Amino acid sequence: ILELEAERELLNPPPSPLDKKFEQWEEQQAVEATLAAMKARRS
Amino acid sequence: AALDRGNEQLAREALGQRQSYQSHTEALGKSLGEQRALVEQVRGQLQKL
Amino acid sequence: ERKYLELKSQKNLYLARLKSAIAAQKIEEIAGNLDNASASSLFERIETKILELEAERELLNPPPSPLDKKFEQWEEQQAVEATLAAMKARRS
Amino acid sequence: MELFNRVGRVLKSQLTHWQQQQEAPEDLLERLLGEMELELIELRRALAQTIATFKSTERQRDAQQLIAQRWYEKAQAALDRGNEQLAREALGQRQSYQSHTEALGKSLGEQRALVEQVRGQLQKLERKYLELKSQKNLYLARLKSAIAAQKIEEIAGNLDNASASSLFERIETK
Amino acid sequence: ILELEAERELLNPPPSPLDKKFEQWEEQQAVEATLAAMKARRS
Q1: C8 labelled as ligand-binding?
Q2: CB-based contact E41:D82 (threshold 8 Å)
Q3: CA angle at D99 for the pair D93 and D103, rounded to the nearest 5°
Q4: Which of C58, E4, E26, E38 yields a CA-CA distance of 20 to 30 A from D110?
């Protein structure tokens, strides 16, 4: 199972840790930046 | 409605779930615009054909 | 007796892992079959064929040279402007 | 020339094999996705089997702790009116059942994240199946659009120089 | 039965705990907010 689980890790590479910072930051923006309009529109 | 009467905590969580659906609109919406020119050229080819 | 039931309890919990993994690798394997160097390359192989057939008409039916694209547009610009040179002077 | 004469005596079968693997790519495109359906329901059944175990264990956790509450309630009454000697012994038996709650209770919390990740994997997995099947029909038109495009211009070319139009001119030269 | 009961839990996912806060809050509004008119109209 671990071998089959790792098999997908090669055929389907996991997202690099870089996006984990961007995806969270961008998602933080996706809320905060989208909330930068709301917290300024509907504070 | 969650924001009403200073209940911003519920609004913050409700918006997080919307971003998941917003990613669909961007991915699915962009694909539709690309197929518009795809169907326009094929029809013009048939008209000329 | 406590050890028998306890071991049998985790028994079914793991039989799902085998069924979960075998049911997981066998679909991504087909998803990979629809990735590069496989059915998606066949999706592109038929595309290379479509592109090959599309280019086939490019040779049998040569496309209009870029020259006319300037003349056809200029002449069409005339076909409107020059025909409109009469209208913009007749029906300004 | 030993293992190709063998290919000759079943050349009718090898031709079919290659024809189904190379040609008719739309046929495989429908069957290969069929196995996904059989596997999706299998994963649907495999997942449900995992959902019938963690809550089957929580009942055992709820059943054992219920027995421990009786001893605590029994020990609570034993203490009444200064009968602490009976309370001391009644609590000793509760510790035996308390060890069950700690061992069985801790295992339940570990399986919660186990069932959450597998479901999220299925949710993400199902999204890929329908999405890939959506573009499936979009491309099958390209094959039908190209094959329906080259085969007419090929005949239009047959009505161009050095062909039927040359026959149009050959009869003209005649 | 528990397996069949959980079978519906997958085929028919239960409402997330989020709505349990909104459905109750919104229902609280559906009474209170609708009662914000009544408690102000028919106090």
Answers
A1: yes
A2: no
A3: 160
A4: E4
